[PDB]
């Protein structure tokens, strides 16, 4: 009969740090009638070997706050992405309180709900469980503070052959506040270079290096010659450069004007993908690469862009204008275009009898001296991921964007103690993350680009509720606006 | 080291947009957009590298050079690295190798974003006048000290390192194919749809053991001999450096890295292989960097980015997050006589002036 | 400082991403600095 906590939502902007608190109201049903049950595709029909899965569904629910808009208002994101060149989550604080158990009775033909029972909760700080948070799943805390959300069920997967199990597979039987200190991770770079990697040169003075300009005097026979010239402002493609753009794994180019696209179903046949143990997984979103060459705004990589969807968009085969296809143009200066080849290489030795032949490079790994920009984080996009535990990794930052970590925030598992009896519980949830910032020091003379609301007169305000009370986010807000030298 | 330098007046003390459109912009690969500033800069970046104001007047038909004791010289270093960094591209303008020479200080310019010869909204214009700087008359001097960040020793002395193949050009012209393959047959990397030559490219031996004559088309830095012409000079007018020292741990520049199986053998299908024309990094590779030459650059600036691998620059030397800072310099404009009646327009009439001194 | 708790995003002064011959608030090919438009001071909002 005495409340166990208060309501905390606000943002304290202090110096180089930010503190964003968010509180929501939640409801936890009873999953699987309190039973751990095996699951596999054989329950769902098992059409393909690429879709094979094996694992267990558990009665426990878990809390997923891993998306940005949980912690940031549309205003707190604007204030952040305009004035800062970087941020990262120093600390985490999570409080869970005001537990209310409601038992349901069906008497005659009506259902009456009355108070009662315990609710078990624990966190895995030894990481002995699977980690299902960083996979971009649903069930994260709602953006708009007045929403009430339902806790997603916890279930996991493990080794499989077809739908059958194997001798090495594992079965885990899982049988309030805490604080968390993130491990050190590099600042997210929010900015779009004002230079391009090939144009770093001084346009006036010329290099002391030479290149081979002419291999023949002119049209005729036995005209072979070698003439060298200076690399300078006149021809800027051949100048000697120290650094070369980041790696690429090519994607197909799909055009939002449906007539441009080839008239055939190439969605899975033409999609780039990587094969693991016989199961072909689509490459999504893949390495960080710009979507389209400058001035091309109707072409997007087929599987390389985080594709959200608008409020009220169905699950299956929704129209093109019911989804929001993010733009990664910001990184075209240091990164190769996603729909383009990385370059060319020589395929043979020229000689008197053989012409010089070259061929395109459709994918390139890391080479010494490469630089690249990682993928941008979005208002709706994920925050952190768990770097899988392996003997090796390279540049662990996750491919969907955000902060790769080897000890991410622990999972929080919660269930209703079986008493069976129809039962559910409800309460409050608060999560407080202390963000650290990197201020914008630039000397640029002319004004930047900023994220601004638009002035056309309209019926609804963006990022606000309409006459039905339905909160809707009109467009993705990714953060690169401020510019910085290369 | 010490040298004697001379600083003219660039651009009539003006910032001026420059782009390919002033040069016509023939090819899309050579497109550029940027600015050109009156400031000059000191560049000592090459290995072999290791205040007096004057005015000019036209009197009758002859030009008389006089001292000017009251004029000043503005100099500043960028130690926060807020300007574009032009010292890393191996431009000319370095201190001369032989101290008895007197050198001219190159003009400062910087390039930024573009589409074609125009400028996109993201492109940013920097005004060097907006940095603080020290003003020096004929008795004042300027100095500062720098501290290099820790960089690995330069090495002068499991599977081999990566390769990106270069076309093979032979010094004897009879051997070379009788066609124009200078640009068409060259190894390139494409960025934003502008094909850019791969030069020098990763560190790779230039030729197999025993075949000294052949050289990679863009693999090795080429240095001109004393007095060599800017355009179309023969091969004996240039020095072509060879990397053959590193042939032990690195693949030859003109060779394929190796072979990989392209299919599964069976009773009905033969075992097939295919050539590896380029190989990225794999676990276990070891490789050598490119050697530095007495005429070669020392350092480069590692572009500020989320990530990079083995940042040591391709041309040579020591890659550094924070390199030695730029040093910018200009001669403060002294306006001529203004008209006795007020006119809001800025004064375009200045005294012809230059300065000289030591480094 | 603005302490406003307004939920939706403010209007901000932004330089439109544009493609043009010259860069706004910067020099042209002859070295003439130019200011394209008058700039107001009123963008953020507050309750009356």
């Amino acid at each position: 009969g005495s409340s166990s906590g208060n309501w905390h939502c606000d943002s304290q902007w202090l110096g180089d740090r930010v503190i964003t608190t968010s509180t929501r109201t939640w409801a936890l049903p009873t999953y699987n009638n309190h039973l751990y049950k095996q699951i596999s595709n054989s329950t769902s029909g098992g059409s393909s070997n690429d879709n094979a899965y094996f694992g267990y569904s558990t009665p426990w629910g878990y809390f997923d706050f891993n998306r940005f808009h949980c912690h940031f208002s549309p205003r707190d994101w604007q204030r952040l992405i305009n004035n800062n060149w970087g941020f990262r989550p120093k600390r985490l604080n999570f409080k869970l309180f005001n537990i209310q158990v409601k038992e349901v009775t069906d008497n005659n033909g009506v259902k009456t709900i009355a108070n009662n029972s315990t609710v078990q909760v624990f966190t895995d700080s030894d990481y002995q469980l699977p980690y299902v948070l960083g996979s971009a799943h649903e069930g994260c805390l709602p953006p708009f503070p007045a929403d009430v959300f339902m806790i997603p069920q916890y279930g996991y997967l493990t080794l499989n052959d077809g739908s059958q199990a194997v001798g090495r597979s594992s079965f885990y039987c899982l049988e309030f506040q805490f604080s968390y200190e993130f491990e050190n991770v590099p600042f997210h770079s929010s900015y779009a270079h004002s230079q391009s990697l090939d144009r770093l040169m001084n346009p006036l003075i010329d290099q002391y290096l030479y290149y081979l300009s002419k291999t023949i005097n002119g049209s005729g026979q036995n005209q072979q010659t070698l003439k060298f010239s200076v690399a300078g402002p006149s021809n800027m493609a051949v100048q000697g450069r120290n650094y070369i753009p980041g790696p690429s794994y090519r994607q197909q180019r799909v055009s939002t004007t449906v007539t441009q696209n080839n008239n055939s179903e190439f969605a899975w046949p033409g999609a780039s993908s990587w094969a693991l143990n016989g199961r072909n997984s689509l490459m999504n979103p893949g390495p960080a690469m710009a979507s389209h060459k400058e001035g091309e705004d109707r072409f997007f990589p087929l599987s390389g862009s985080l594709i959200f969807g608008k409020q009220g968009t169905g699950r299956d085969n929704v129209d093109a204008d019911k989804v929001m296809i993010t733009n990664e143009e910001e990184i075209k200066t240091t990164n190769p275009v996603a729909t383009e080849s990385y370059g060319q290489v020589a395929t043979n030795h020229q000689s008197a009898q053989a012409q010089a032949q070259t061929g395109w490079v459709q994918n390139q790994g890391i080479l010494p001296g490469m630089v690249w920009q990682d993928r941008d984080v979005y208002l709706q996009g994920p925050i952190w991921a768990k770097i899988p535990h392996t003997d090796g990794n390279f540049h662990p930052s996750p491919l969907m964007g955000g902060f790769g970590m080897k000890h991410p925030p622990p999972q929080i598992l919660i269930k209703n103690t079986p008493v069976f009896i129809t039962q559910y519980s409800t309460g409050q949830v608060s999560v407080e993350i202390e963000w650290e910032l990197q201020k914008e020091n630039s000397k640029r003379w002319n004004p930047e680009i900023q994220y601004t609301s638009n002035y056309y007169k309209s019926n609804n305000v963006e990022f606000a509720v309409n006459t039905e009370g339905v909160y809707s986010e009109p467009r993705p807000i990714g953060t690169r606006y401020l510019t910085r030298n290369l | 080291s010490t040298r004697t330098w001379a600083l003219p007046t660039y651009n009539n003390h003006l910032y001026k947009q420059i782009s390919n459109s002033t040069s016509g912009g023939s090819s899309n690969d050579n497109a550029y957009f940027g600015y050109s500033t009156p400031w000059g800069y000191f560049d000592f970046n090459r290995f072999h590298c290791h205040i007096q104001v004057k005015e000019v007047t036209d009197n009758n038909g002859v030009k008389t050079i006089a001292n000017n004791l009251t004029s000043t010289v503005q100099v500043f270093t960028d130690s926060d690295y807020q300007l574009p960094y032009v010292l890393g591209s191996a431009h000319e303008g370095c201190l001369p190798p032989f101290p008895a020479d007197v050198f001219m200080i190159p003009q400062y310019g910087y390039l930024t974003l573009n589409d074609g010869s125009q400028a996109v909204g993201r492109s940013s214009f920097y005004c060097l006048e907006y940095f603080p700087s020290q003003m020096l008359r004929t008795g004042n001097n300027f100095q500062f000290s720098y501290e290099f960040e820790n960089v690995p020793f330069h090495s002068s002395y499991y599977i081999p390192g990566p390769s990106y193949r270069q076309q093979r050009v032979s010094t004897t012209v009879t051997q070379n194919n009788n066609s124009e393959f200078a640009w068409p047959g060259a190894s390139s990397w494409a960025l934003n749809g502008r094909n850019s030559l791969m030069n020098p490219g990763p560190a790779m031996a230039s030729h197999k053991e025993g075949e000294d004559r052949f050289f990679p088309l863009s693999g090795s830095l080429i240095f001109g001999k004393q007095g060599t012409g800017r355009d179309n000079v023969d091969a004996d007018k240039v020095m072509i450096t060879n990397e053959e020292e590193i042939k032990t741990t690195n693949p030859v520049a003109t060779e394929s890295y190796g072979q990989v199986a392209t299919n599964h053998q069976s009773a009905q299908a033969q075992a097939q292989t295919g050539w590896v024309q380029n190989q990225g990094i794999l676990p276990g590779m070891v490789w050598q960097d490119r050697d530095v030459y007495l005429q070669g650059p020392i350092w480069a600036k590692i572009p500020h980015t989320d990530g990079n691998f083995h940042p040591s620059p391709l041309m040579g030397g020591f890659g550094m997050k924070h390199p030695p800072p730029q040093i910018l310099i200009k001669n403060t404009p002294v306006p001529a006589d203004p008209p006795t009646a007020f006119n809001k327009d800025k004064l375009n009439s200045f005294i012809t002036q230059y300065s000289t001194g030591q480094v | 400082k603005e302490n406003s708790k307004r939920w939706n995003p403010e209007i901000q002064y932004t330089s439109n991403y544009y493609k043009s011959n010259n860069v706004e608030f910067a020099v042209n090919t002859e070295g003439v600095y130019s200011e394209p438009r008058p700039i107001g001071t009123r963008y953020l909002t507050r309750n009356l």
Epitope: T259, D321, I449 | - | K19
Partner: antibody, heavy 128, light 109 residues
Framework: EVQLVESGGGLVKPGGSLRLSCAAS????????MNWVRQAPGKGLEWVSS????????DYADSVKGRFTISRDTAMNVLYLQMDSLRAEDTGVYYC??????????????????????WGQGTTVTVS | SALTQPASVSGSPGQSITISCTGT?????????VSWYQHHPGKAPKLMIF???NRPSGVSNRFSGSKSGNTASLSISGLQAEDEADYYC??????????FGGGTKLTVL
């Protein structure tokens, strides 16, 4: 004050060719899409062709496709519609409009269409 | 063509008026685009409505719009003699073309 003035309309026998120019003033001409529409005598507005911001995408109404070529010089802001192999249906009043986008920095690749923003008074092309 | 819009509508000063154009298949109002134009004879046409109902800076509040199902409609209120013009509706299409209705001449009495 943003203004677009059409020019070059006139009288040309069928089968002839007419070039129409649109002189843009007051705004950045290379940052916007630009497109031509046509009003036949005693009829409603009809659309002819279009040209994108970076000139990558040129579009044509089904009827005039192949007989017209739209292009902009861009040295000095102007727009050009090359009318070749004119018919009797090409009589009308040609307008020069620019699709209006409030923010030129796209946040998403598929952007909802907002329609034309600035129009010219149009020139009359007549065939006999 | 492709957008059916009535030949002419008329109203007395002060009275509201609903002009409505209909379209076929999916492409009608693809993305958000259903746009209403005001064409006075001999002068430049004006974009009264951009989007289903959003209206630009220049337009007066009197003009409004909505799209119900397959039908979009322009609603003029507080009618005046200066509102007499031709009114066209347009919608972007799937091939990146725009499609204008035949248009309604509104004669205020």
């Amino acid at each position: 004050e943003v203004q677009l003035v059409e020019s070059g309309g006139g009288l040309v026998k069928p089968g002839g060719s007419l070039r129409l120019s649109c002189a843009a003033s007051g705004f950045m001409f290379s940052s916007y899409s630009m497109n031509w529409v046509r009003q036949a005598p005693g009829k409603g507005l009809e659309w002819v062709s279009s040209i994108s911001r970076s000139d990558s995408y040129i579009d044509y109404a089904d009827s005039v496709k192949g007989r017209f070529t739209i292009s902009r010089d861009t040295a000095m802001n102007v727009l050009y519609l090359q009318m070749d192999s004119l018919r009797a249906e090409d009589t009308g009043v040609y307008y020069c409009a620019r699709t209006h986008v409030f923010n030129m920095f796209r946040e998403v690749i598929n952007d909802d269409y907002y329609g034309m923003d600035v129009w010219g008074q149009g020139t009359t092309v007549t065939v006999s | 063509s492709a957008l059916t819009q009535p030949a002419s509508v008329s109203g007395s000063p002060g009275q509201s008026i609903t002009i409505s154009c209909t379209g076929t298949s999916s492409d009608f109002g693809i993305y958000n685009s259903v746009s209403w134009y005001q064409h006075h004879p001999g002068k430049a046409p004006k974009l009264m409505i951009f989007g289903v109902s959003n209206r630009p800076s220049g337009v007066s509040n009197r003009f409004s719009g909505s799209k119900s199902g397959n039908t979009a409609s322009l609603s003029i209120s507080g009618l005046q003699a200066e509102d007499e013009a031709d009114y066209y509706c347009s919608s972007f299409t799937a091939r990146s073309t725009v499609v204008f209705g035949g248009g309604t001449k509104l004669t205020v009495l």
